[PDB]
Design a binder for these strands. Structure first.
Ligand code: MG
Ligand code: MG
Ligand code: MG
Length: 458
RNA sequence: GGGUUGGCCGAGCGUUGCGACGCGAAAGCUAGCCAGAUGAUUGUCCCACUAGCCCAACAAGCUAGAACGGGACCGGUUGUUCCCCCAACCGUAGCCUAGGGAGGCAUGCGUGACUGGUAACGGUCAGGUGUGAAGCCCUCCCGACAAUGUAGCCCGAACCGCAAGGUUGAAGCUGAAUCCGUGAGGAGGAAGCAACUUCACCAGUGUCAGGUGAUAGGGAACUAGGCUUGAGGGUAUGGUGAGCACAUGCGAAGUGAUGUCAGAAGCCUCGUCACAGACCAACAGGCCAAAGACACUGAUAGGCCUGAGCCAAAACGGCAAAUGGAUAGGCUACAUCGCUCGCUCGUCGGUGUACGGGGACGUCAAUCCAUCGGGGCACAGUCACCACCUAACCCCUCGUGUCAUCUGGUUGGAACGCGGUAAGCCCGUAUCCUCGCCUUGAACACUCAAGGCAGGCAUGCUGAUGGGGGUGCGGGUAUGGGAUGCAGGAGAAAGCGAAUGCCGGUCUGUAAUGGACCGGAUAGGGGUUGAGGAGACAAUCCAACAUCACCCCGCCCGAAAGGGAGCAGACUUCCUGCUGGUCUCUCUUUGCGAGAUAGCCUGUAGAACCUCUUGAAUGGAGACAAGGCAAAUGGCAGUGGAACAAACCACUGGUGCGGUCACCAACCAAACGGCCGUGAGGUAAAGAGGCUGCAAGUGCGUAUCGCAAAGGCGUUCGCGCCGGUUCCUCUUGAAAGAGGGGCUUUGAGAGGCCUGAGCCGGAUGUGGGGAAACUCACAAGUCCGGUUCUUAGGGGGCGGGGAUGGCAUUCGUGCCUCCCUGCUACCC
């Protein structure tokens, strides 16, 4: 009976087991890990967690080369019982090109809906290990962290007067296949047999180290985490070799930058990193990695960092505003005619992500010059669907007044009951700029203490 | 490094009523041409000259007249601000057109009335409203004066209480006397008329003066037009050499290069943090004690200026503002541009070209151009070469007229006017072939029927007091810009006793549609009338080819009813067949890149899986430690709290095999007074059957998958190049771009569709633009002829007729809703 298990305690019990394994690895035992993570993944009430996770979040409709698809409320009952380590083989992958408006067919392989449960079950009992052995200054696909905190550790490491003055950008080029299959058999402590079965078949080639998208791991829950374990370290190794030349490191999944003390320092830092990239098989490109003076700046994440005189301020980068002026322009070309309730409905959510993603930087000026340059598009859109009428007319037609600047886009229509309705553009810029509060570096959301962070902070 | 506010030059053409074909037979409208009649041929005076008078017939002094004789003048423009001279063109007259009013008329749309008719289908007046034109309305009245519209430029005020009423002033508009001139014209402006609302501030504060900025609205200039002496020759700064697609073209319609969404050309904004500002806020470097008049707070209190730069202080404060430059004075003419559909206009703004002689005043503004750089605009064209038509200004000849209007002729065209019921359909009638039925007041489902088939007709009613069907007649009704074409049939207006059709020849040009010539056919009789010639004026038929005015016979089809007759038969309709192109969808096909499961065999592990065989080498409860391993395990088991205890809250747990430890249950291979006992030595082990997992093969590149089915140029006689398609590589944020390996290609079947944009050549017209050529519109102007493109579906934009009226307030104009209700030519 699937509709009988109490989900109100599933999370509690699984989280309790995860806390146990985390606190265990906190002590240098390493043996108790492969007795709780062998007990969790071979029991009820955690196995159903994977099925529940995989059946939702889409991706449970289109199958791999099996035909089978659960999609129901009673076929996912013998699926639970059919999850055994003994007698397991994979069923390759079917390459399906996901359509794109631009036509950018991005190859995303897809596994079976029973195979996917295993990839989503073993993510448990491996996730607690990754958090406990993380790199302190590592962000990306972690729990409770946000991509804004990567800029957070820049008002501090680089913010004060002296700090550092030279930065190294760097970028790794290898795809997920280049990782040595032998190497992965000896470090990730999930299992020494299932992992061997997995790689040899497919499960690879899917994309580069991390998903191309920012929040859509459609099918794979293990792929992000393996990268965050193979690319770990790199911080104790960095600070042990070079002692006092004020070195530091940040990394948001990919896209990691290192602050040196002088150009001389950042010539062996590109060597000690190079040594710690051959034990795996993926190296750094000799085309894009540059050492940059701080007064010229660099493009890290969707942000730009520079120093003007004696002043640190980080502002929206040039090749990210231009994208936002290309996504809008291509929604006013496919939806030219529209009905004026589709212009507002389509262009509203588009101007909310680009506002949330820069809500915490010095961008009050940048939010202007980025609404006018769309205002001169709506108005030019308005006078192209009335090639005969006059200006005063198009104006009184699609521009209203609210009790403010009398010229805003919208329609002051009504409702069924005789109430004055309203619709209008967000007009990015009416967003209180907030200075974020950084996450403590050593925070670990699975240790039994420090439970007041994260959940309450969310 | 945080709060808030800004954005726009206007008006029409491309978007509704009629559109077929035959004929101007009469009237109206209109284009050339041909000849006349009448007007006009545009400032004022002198010198005329034009004649006349009878000024005697002047050397006459008078009326008055002509576009083109000569002087002297006045007014308005242009020749870069203003003054003084000079040169140039133009006027106050006559006549139309654009525009504004007043009537009738035809028509749209609906509301009432009286009626024509069996019933289909209609008619006649009065009420309310739209429309009367780039093709398509009639008489009057204004008529270059006007209404309109705006980016630039002006005003948009003082005033005193006086309850806001006047005194003003006023951007400006009308402008009378008065005087000087002969006169056109000058100097002077008596008297009137006029928008004048709303705020925000000028070293805080509470105070008075002076000032500043933006708007409600008014004003100036322009909007406000044309012709009034020609013809010829040369002269582009004026235009044209389709259209549409694209790797290769179609087509009759230049040759070339480049470009089509990561965008050529053109344009708007800003300078390396790269939209114009301004207020507060905070921070920093500075300045005056409140900086025009007066208590009021105040100096570890203020205020202000400058700041993502400087200086300077109460000044008109100055500097350079990506690199490099030019510059005086513009209600002027022309061409171009003001952030993208083509064409006309109107105000305003900068560029480029052209624009007399002196003198006076005194230039420069973050104004402008050229180059680089950053961010934006999209309905796809740009740039050179060649060939041709045109000649306003320019130069050279020959001119004596030119413009408008009205008459009388001639040739024409039409959306204006007149003629045509016909096959479809509706109704009436006649007759005939009829005959199908669930029940049925029944002669017993078979004769006077309802529920009610059907039909008529939303149970709502007649309804075997009946149904059904073609056929011959008789009334009424069609509503008509091209969209694959063709062929016969029902029908056939206008013309013909020889024709502008039709049929056969000749001949000529267009890409296609043509024009001029010859031949060829082409009607059953009989009777009145002469409608008008002619016979004149009495003396004749036409006896009606006056396309047949009116009756009888035969002729053919119909039950009569009476309908029809020689070749032609234009346009719109209903029928038959063939033929064509566009769609959607189920099949198969091969070329690409993925690709297992089942099943069968080949070697292996069972310690955590069973059943065993063995003589035993076995059965239980415990303790520690663990970068060894695993066949259902933690929907579990605990403690302390909700005292405990029901949920509820915290904390604890390594699940088994193997490692080290030890304990209890039977050993008797040990010792061994042979068994007649005593202590004590280990509880080790190996083969068999399925059962499962691993590494392999076969099952197979099979099912199952994702995309795709495009070729063209010369055979240098290989192949090359330009493309298409699929798979893989680096690239940035990108749909773009590059570099490689493959192929470069098949047939059926089911169901739909036939609507619209243009462009080209001649023939008839018209209105804008223009001097002319040409240009953009009139359903693609219409017609005809030759061509390419486009057909679910949205979004917007109009119009007509009514309702209770909601609102704002002009109090009866508009925003609105509620349907009815035509429009899509317009963008995806
Ligand atoms: Mg049109
Ligand atoms: Mg006609
Ligand atoms: Mg059309």
């Amino acid at each position: 009976s699937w509709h009988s298990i109490d989900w109100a305690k599933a999370n509690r019990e699984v989280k309790r087991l995860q806390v146990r394994i985390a606190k265990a690895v906190k002590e240098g035992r390493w043996g108790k890990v492969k007795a709780l993570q062998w007990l969790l993944t071979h029991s009820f009430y955690g196995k159903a967690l994977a099925v529940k996770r995989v059946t939702d979040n889409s991706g449970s409709k289109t199958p791999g080369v099996d035909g089978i698809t659960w999609s129901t409320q009673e076929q996912k009952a013998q699926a639970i019982k059919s999850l055994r380590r003994r007698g397991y083989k994979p069923q390759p992958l079917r390459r399906v090109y996901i359509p794109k408006a631009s036509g950018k067919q991005r190859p995303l392989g897809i596994p079976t809906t029973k195979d996917r449960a295993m990839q989503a079950l073993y993510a448990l009992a491996l996730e607690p290990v990754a958090e406990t052995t993380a790199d302190r200054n590592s962000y990306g696909f972690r729990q409770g962290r946000c991509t804004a905190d990567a800029a957070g550790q820049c008002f501090t490491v680089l913010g004060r007067s002296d700090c550092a003055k030279y930065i190294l950008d760097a970028d790794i080029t290898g795809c997920f296949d280049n990782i040595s299959h032998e190497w992965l058999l000896d470090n990730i402590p999930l299992d020494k047999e299932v992992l061997r079965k997995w790689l040899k078949s497919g499960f690879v080639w899917k994309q580069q180290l991390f998903p191309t998208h920012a929040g859509t791991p459609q099918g794979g829950v293990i792929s992000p985490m393996l990268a965050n374990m193979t690319l770990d370290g790199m911080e104790e190794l960095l600070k042990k070799h070079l002692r006092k030349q004020k070195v530091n490191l940040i990394r948001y999944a990919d896209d990691f930058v290192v602050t040196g003390e002088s150009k001389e320092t950042l010539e062996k830092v590109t060597t000690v990193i190079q040594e710690f990239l051959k034990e795996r098989g993926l190296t750094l490109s000799e085309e894009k990695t540059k050492v940059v003076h701080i007064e010229e700046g660099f493009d890290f994440l969707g942000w730009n960092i520079r120093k003007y005189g004696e002043k640190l301020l980080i502002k929206p980068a040039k090749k990210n505003i231009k994208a936002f002026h290309k996504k809008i322009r291509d929604a006013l070309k496919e939806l030219r005619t529209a009905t004026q309730e589709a212009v507002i409905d389509t262009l509203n959510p588009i101007i909310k992500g680009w506002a949330n993603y820069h809500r915490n930087q010095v961008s009050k000026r940048i939010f202007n010059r980025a609404d006018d340059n769309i205002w001169h598009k709506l108005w030019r859109w308005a006078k192209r669907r009335h090639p005969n009428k006059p200006a005063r007319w198009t104006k009184n037609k699609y521009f209203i007044k609210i009790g403010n600047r009398h010229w805003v886009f919208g329609t002051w229509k009504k409702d069924k009951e005789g109430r004055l309705r309203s619709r209008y553009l967000i007009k990015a810029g009416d967003t209180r700029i907030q200075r974020h509060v950084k996450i403590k570096a050593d925070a670990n959301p699975f240790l039994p203490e420090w439970a007041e962070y994260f959940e309450e902070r969310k």
